[PDB]
Ligand binder design. Structure first.
Ligand code: ADP
Lengths: 115, 348, 104
């Protein structure tokens, strides 16, 4: 329903952002992938893209890093009530191993220590 | 008539008061602060019992301290710090020529890798026991010649902070017996003093092993020097701050004992330029020479492979030679083209 | 091989201890120890690289496992999962030999 908006634009993004500027766009389009992947209010199609954005990132003078502010400026956006959270589950085997993601498993550990 | 002689003559009255002095022999106190008398070891000399200064700081006179002794009476004088050789002609000076990674061409993987393994434990050591392992110590820059070995450590020489001990391994050895082991324990103890430090021993086939059976004088003198160098690369610590890297041709004549991960962990194969690195070297040594615009680098790189960085600066050197006996403005395309085809004549 | 044939003679040594360049039933214990002092995320396997038993010291086990961790420092990772293990091993997992087909 709202798949090919984010995915079609993202297919247009992977040659104008990835090749090769990306840097401030690391804080722009990936955060736009997740906020336009949140404005349509999906939770099945939400946790199917962040893990499909890894494994191959960009060229020289850009970075594989700096999606941690793409994560941490998105986690504390919803406080959905009963329990459903794949936000707590999917973000504990996709963010495996970075020095920048200390606040991910730390403050999401605190999220597990409260909910 | 008086201030002149007062200053530049009465300043030179110092020659008599300094001429009165007597000089002091040196030695190493084998400790045993036998309270009122210690036993010291002179340098070429016997061990013997010496009295003391009587208000010296005896409590820090540690076993193995350089101390100065009187000549005639022979009572111990003012102490000394631990000496250094002309390792000053080793540490304090090498070949760091403001050469940077800009002159290093086409081996960005090898120099980013060597830079990370050698000084990145000195930038962020806390990430390694975080992972749960000590950082490695040594790298062996084996490759065909040319290729940027000695230099590579020139670029490392002019981009680091610690005293880059850059030594040729054949100015180590001397004609006296047990002398080279003195020099190598002096080198590594000097590395213990200033930390963290990098020790560059290139061309090391002088100390390089595959130890023999029979030459018995000119080789077993070094095959016990390699024992001291080997048993201080290893030691009983891990040296814990200093990292040595060695660069040589012929890795297939080195000792197995010195190659076992530990003495030299990440053996780096620096390799001949492929095509991309060929045009890298060609641009870098073709840089400061005046040029054309649309000078066809691509046919030069396409033309004949198997060169080295030295052979490509030999190309630009021969083409500038062609203009310098031919009296032109810079080169032409036929001067690079006449340059490679005479370097290609230079096979073995 | 050239020590001296008068350094033993039951009085100066009386002993001799061979160190084996270990194999199958020992190699597993070396990997178990050296991996037991690291961070692992269990995507690793143990006996897969105990397999291919080919001419290793313990020093190069510390080199491929130490090199596995240091190759995991690239992505600033506090563990090691799959490639840095296999990756470092293959890179310097004996940088090969020289077989020699027909005979064999
Ligand atoms: N990648 C390279 N870029 C520039 N010069 C190189 C490169 N590789 C080798 N050289 C040449 O090698 C010289 C340095 O000596 P080197 O190649 O290390 O020989 P050795 O390994 O015997 O010291 C330099 O003067 C340089 O011209």
């Amino acid at each position: 329903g709202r798949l090919q908006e984010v995915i079609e634009t993202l297919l247009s993004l992977e040659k104008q952002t990835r090749t090769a500027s990306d840097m401030v766009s690391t804080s722009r389009i990936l955060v736009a992938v997740v906020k336009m992947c949140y404005e349509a209010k999906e939770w099945d199609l939400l946790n199917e893209n962040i893990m499909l954005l890894s494994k191959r990132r960009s060229q020289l003078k850009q970075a594989v890093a700096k999606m941690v502010q793409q994560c941490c400026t998105y986690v504390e956006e919803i406080t959905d009530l009963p329990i459903k959270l794949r936000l707590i589950d999917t973000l504990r085997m996709v963010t495996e191993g970075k020095i920048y993601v200390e606040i991910e498993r730390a403050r999401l550990t605190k999220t597990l220590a409260t909910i | 008539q008086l201030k002149e002689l007062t200053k530049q003559y009465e300043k030179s009255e110092n020659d008599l008061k300094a001429l009165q002095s007597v000089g002091q022999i040196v030695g190493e106190v084998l400790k045993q602060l036998t309270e009122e008398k210690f036993i010291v070891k002179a340098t070429n000399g016997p061990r013997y019992v010496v009295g003391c200064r009587r208000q010296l700081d005896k409590s820090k006179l540690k076993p193995g301290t350089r101390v100065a002794l009187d000549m005639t009476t022979l009572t111990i004088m003012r102490y000394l710090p631990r000496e250094v050789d002309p390792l000053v002609y080793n540490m304090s000076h090498e070949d760091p020529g403001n050469v940077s990674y800009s002159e290093i061409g086409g081996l960005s993987e090898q120099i980013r890798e060597l830079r990370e393994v050698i000084e990145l434990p000195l930038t962020n050591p806390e990430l390694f026991q975080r992972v749960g392992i000590i950082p490695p110590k040594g790298c062996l820059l084996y490759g065909p010649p040319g290729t940027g070995k000695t230099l590579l450590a020139r670029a490392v020489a002019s981009q680091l902070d610690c005293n880059f001990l850059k030594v040729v391994s054949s100015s180590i050895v001397d004609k006296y017996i047990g002398e080279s082991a003195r020099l190598i324990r002096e080198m590594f103890n000097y590395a213990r003093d200033h930390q963290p430090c990098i020790i560059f021993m290139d061309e090391i086939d002088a100390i390089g092993g595959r130890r023999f059976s029979e030459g018995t004088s000119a080789d077993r003198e070094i095959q016990r020097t390699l024992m001291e160098l080997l048993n201080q690369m290893d030691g009983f610590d891990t040296l814990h701050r200093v990292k040595m890297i060695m660069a040589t041709n012929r890795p297939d004549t080195l000792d197995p004992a010195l190659l076992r991960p530990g003495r030299l962990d990440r053996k780096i194969h620096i390799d001949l330029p492929n095509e991309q690195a060929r045009l890298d070297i060609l641009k870098i040594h073709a840089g400061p020479i005046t040029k054309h615009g649309e000078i066809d680098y691509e046919a030069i790189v396409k033309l004949s492979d198997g060169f080295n960085g030295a052979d490509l600066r030999n190309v630009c050197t021969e083409a500038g030679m062609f203009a310098i006996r031919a009296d032109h403005d810079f080169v032409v395309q036929e001067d690079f083209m006449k340059a490679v085809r005479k370097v290609a004549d230079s096979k073995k | 091989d050239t020590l001296d044939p008068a350094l033993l003679r039951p009085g100066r040594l009386d002993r001799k201890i061979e160190f084996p360049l270990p194999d199958r039933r020992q190699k597993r214990l070396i990997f178990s120890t050296i991996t037991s002092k690291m961070n692992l995320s269990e995507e690793v396997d143990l006996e897969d690289y105990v397999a291919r038993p080919d001419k290793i010291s313990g020093a190069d086990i510390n080199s491929i496992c130490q090199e596995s961790g240091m190759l995991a420092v690239r992505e600033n990772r506090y563990i090691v999962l799959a490639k840095d293990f296999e990756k470092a091993y293959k890179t310097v997992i004996k940088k090969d030999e020289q077989e020699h087909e027909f005979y064999k």
